[PDB]
DNA sequence: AAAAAAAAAAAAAAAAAAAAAAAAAAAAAAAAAAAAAAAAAAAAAAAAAAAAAAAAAAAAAAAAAAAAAAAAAAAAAAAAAAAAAAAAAAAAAAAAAAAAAAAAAAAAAAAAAAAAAA
């Protein structure tokens, strides 16, 4: 269907795409949700919603 | 001269393949539109350049949203067990150039035969 989905591409080999509803609201001041996106000595570049 | 293996007799067991004819689909190989890409012309918006200017960082200082401290409480993520996906390492292989052995054409010359001359 059309459902809001996240996508991100990193340096090297990443085109991972999780669903948007897994992450919940937070108050600005805490952050650090620690998403689970394994990366071996590369750098993230892009996120899209 | 001893050993061993093929082949053939006849009732039994058990298999395999080539084509025709029409109509539909599925691979697989081509011309041919159609658009990127590239070479070589003229052409034209941007940087340069200069003078002239006035809009936002400094500075004084209050005060009001703040980030550390304290506390309680919820429970995301990390590391350890197992269980699947997916890719290099190494080894193997079927056609394929190289070599060697047998079939068909070749004439030189003669044995045997057929035929005829005087």
Helix segment count?
0
Strand order of the largest sheet: 1-2
Radius of gyration: 12 Å
Task: Output the structural class.
Answer: mainly beta
Tell me the overall shape. flat
Number of DSSP-assigned strands: 2
Oligomer: part of a larger assembly
Helix content: under 10%
Report the end-to-end length measured between terminal Cα atoms.
15 Å
The ordered H/E elements are: EE
Largest β sheet strand count, sense and barrel closure: 2 strands, antiparallel
Our estimate of the beta-strand percent is 15-25%
PDB class: isomerase
Keywords: DNA-protein complex, type IIA topoisomerase DNA gyrase, isomerase
Entry title: E. coli DNA gyrase bound to a DNA crossover
Name: DNA gyrase subunit A
Task: Please tag this protein with its features.
1 chains; mainly beta; two-stranded antiparallel sheet; 2 strands; DNA-binding; DNA gyrase subunit A
Could you please describe the fold and organization of this structure?
- The protein has 49 residues and is an all-beta fold.
- The protein is 0% helix and 18% strand.
- It has no helices and two strands.
- The protein has a two-stranded antiparallel sheet with strand order 1-2.
- The radius of gyration is 12 Å and the shape is flat.
- The protein starts with 6 loop residues before the first strand and ends with a strand.
- The relative contact order is 0.42.
- The structure holds one DNA strand of 118 nucleotides.
- A motif (GyrA-box) lies at residues 25-31.
- Belongs to the type II topoisomerase GyrA/ParC subunit family.
- It is found in: Cytoplasm.
């Amino acid at each position: 269907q059309e459902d809001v989905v996240v996508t991100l591409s990193h340096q090297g080999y990443v085109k991972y795409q999780p669903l948007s509803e897994y992450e919940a609201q937070r108050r600005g001041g805490k952050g650090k949700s620690a998403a689970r996106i394994k990366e071996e000595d590369f750098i993230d570049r892009l996120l899209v919603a």
